[PDB]
Every structure is written in structure tokens, then in C-alpha cells.
Structure 1
Amino acid sequence: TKDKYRVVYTDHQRLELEKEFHYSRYITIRRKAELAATLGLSERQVKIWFQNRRAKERKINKKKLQQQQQQ
């Protein structure tokens, strides 16, 4: 696990994760392992980041929908 209490990821670390997310919204066990290793993060952090990004996507989609219902 990781705690005390949350760490900020570097702009470069975020960038790579965003790219990879555009490549696929679900990361494979292998990919996860490549990415962790090259980014200096744990597999679990990568797991979780992918979970959060999908939640963010759901949240942005609901809003897109709420606007479209109103225009």
C-alpha cells in the first residue's frame, strides 16, 4: 500500500498516463508493469490512477449529457 497522505504526480508522469489512457481505457497487466517501471510509480498507483481517470470520464460525460439535455 501507500500512505502519508497523498503525493502529487509530476507533469511528466501525468502526461504519459493520459497518453496511455487515450491508447486504452483499461490497462493490461503487462502494460501496467511497463508503465510503472518506466515512470517510477507502483503498479497499485497505476491501477488506481486508471480507476480514477475512468471516474473522471464518467463525471465529464454526465455533464456533457446535462448540457445537451439543455441545448
Structure 2
Amino acid sequence: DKYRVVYTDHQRLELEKEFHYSRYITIRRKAELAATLGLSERQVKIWFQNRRAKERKINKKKLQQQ
């Protein structure tokens, strides 16, 4: 049992650089990237799902209004 794993900065770099392109992932690029960053398509799926919840959580607060 291994609950979690941290991702190399290079994996986090590329992953993040795609989020900038689209907050959503084509099954092509899901798999195209999965392979070039050596990670399960299911992973690149959840990372993008999670990444959005961050932008959502930042953006909510960036509504400081005050």
C-alpha cells in the first residue's frame, strides 16, 4: 500500500504548462502526455481535475471585494 507519491518538478513543470493551454485534456493529449511524462492516464486525469479545484479555490479568494 502506497497512499501517495510526489511528482518530479519536471513532471509538475510539464503538467502545469499544459493547464495553461487548456484547463481540460483531450484523450489524445491525456495519453500523449501520460507516456512522455511516464504516468498512468488515470493520474494525468485526476491531476487536471485537482488542478482546476485549486484555480477555483484561488479565484474564490481573489474575490477580496474589500
TM-score (norm 1): 0.88
CA RMSD of aligned residues (A): 1.1
Distance 1:22 1:13 in 2: 15
Q: How much has 1:70 moved relative to structure 2? A: 3.9
Which protein shows a greater Rg? 1
Give the 3-state SS of the residue equivalent to 2:51 in structure 1. Answer: helix
Question: Which stretches in structure 1 are left out of the alignment for 5+ residues?
Answer: none
> Which ranges of 4 or more aligned residues in structure 1 deviate by more than 4 Å?
none
Q: Which has the higher helix share?
A: 1
Q: How much has 1:12 moved relative to structure 2? A: 0.2
Distance 1:43 1:15 in 2: 17
CA-to-aligned-CA distance 1:3-52 (integer Å, 9 cap, x gap): 51100000000000110000101000000000000001000000000000
Distance 1:60 1:16 in 2: 21
Aligned residue number for residue 5 of structure 1: 3
Percent sequence identity over matched residues? 100
Question: Which stretches in structure 2 are left out of the alignment for 5+ residues?
Answer: none
Distance 1:21 1:35 in 2: 12
Distance 2:8 2:21 in 1: 20
Count of aligned pairs between the two proteins: 66
Q: How much has 1:54 moved relative to structure 2? A: 0.2
Distance 1:51 1:33 in 2: 16
